[PDB]
Structure 1
């Protein structure tokens, strides 16, 4: 692991995310993410919003801490996820939970630096549909992003949390509609 307070750190975090998730999000989404990365660098040439980059870095350096804290909260509130017959019982499946947890955070950070829910509309909404095609309707999943939200916002002040909270709310609402309107 490695943390940094530079713009190159956030760029590298997005690059590694594009590489790791390319096969999962599909080709239309990696094109969106590649264009996003090119545009953020172009506008960085004209000066970046320091408050947004500060919140973005703070969540990025503590990504694994947030992932571990949220996953621990989720297993406690819903032990059926890791129990036999659960979706995260298998060590590979549980590792995939933590992977998507860190991926969900990257999407949150992509919205922070841009101040727009665009990356969650394009990449997030499509991946939630594909994630439910492979998993199915598991009611404990609704508490997933809540644990991620509570674990991320606990590292921010009230002003920074108010800036980040809408993107978590947007994902939870989207998961809610995908959850209860999937087989319809």
Structure 2
């Protein structure tokens, strides 16, 4: 989370948190429930969104769905929606703890070697998350989707 980054970043200098950092905790905690209210909106639309993600990741990339591709077959596609479910679940964690570590300690750190040992094309997974961010805009209004927009494209930046 954000307080953890301040306690850590202040701990390697052997000092208490300064004036600016205590702002960064205080301002983060005052915007508390709005992340809490937002994640309940997204949890009610996880079956909403991943159905829309499978819309365009496969019409864009029929290579993976076709016989021979990695996602060919039922059970391969079955977990395919599961990876969207874990990613969307991770983003609800990142939207709450207002930073990137739950998207980075999980999911991002070492993701390429995971997929490369699986056969999933790592470029395709970048479009999958980009597809997932494209899908979240429809079930979300303009007020709060740019609140969740910077959490998505960090994942794309992490995967390249």
Q: TM-score, normalised by structure 2?
A: 0.74
Alignment partner, residue 128 of structure 1: 111
1:101 is the counterpart of 2:88: no
Say if 1:153 and 1:164, in contact at 8 Å, map to a contact too: no
Whether the 8 Å contact between 2:58 and 2:65 is mirrored in structure 1 is yes
Secondary structure of 2:143's counterpart equals helix
Number of the residue aligned with 2:50 = 67
Deviation track 1:111-160 (CA, whole Å, cap 9, x = no partner) reads 11111111011011136232332125354333111111011122222221
Out of 50, 53, 57, the position equivalent to 2:36 is: 53
CA 60–132 in structure 1, closer or farther in 2 if over 3 Å, else same? farther
Query: Partners in 1 of 2:126 and 2:102 — Cα distance?
Result: 21
TM alignment of 1:24-43, pairs within 5 A: none
Structure 2's unaligned 5+ residue stretches are 1-28
1:50 deviates by 2.2
Q: Equivalences for 1:4-15 in 2 at 5 Å? A: none
In the other structure, the counterpart of 2:159 is 175
Aligned length: 131
- Which of 69, 88, 102 is the matching residue for 1:119? 102
Unaligned runs of 5+ in 1: 1-45, 177-184
Q: 143-152 or 46-55: which moved more? A: 46-55
Root mean square deviation of aligned Cα: 2.0
Q: Alignment partner for residue 137 of structure 2, among 153, 174, 178?
A: 153
Structure of larger gyration radius: 2
| TM-score for the superposition, normalised by structure 1 | 0.65
CA contact (8 A) 1:108 1:167 kept: yes
Q: Is the 8 A contact 1:74 1:144 kept in 2?
A: yes
Instruction: Say whether the 8 Å CA contact 2:129–2:155 is kept in structure 1.
Output: yes
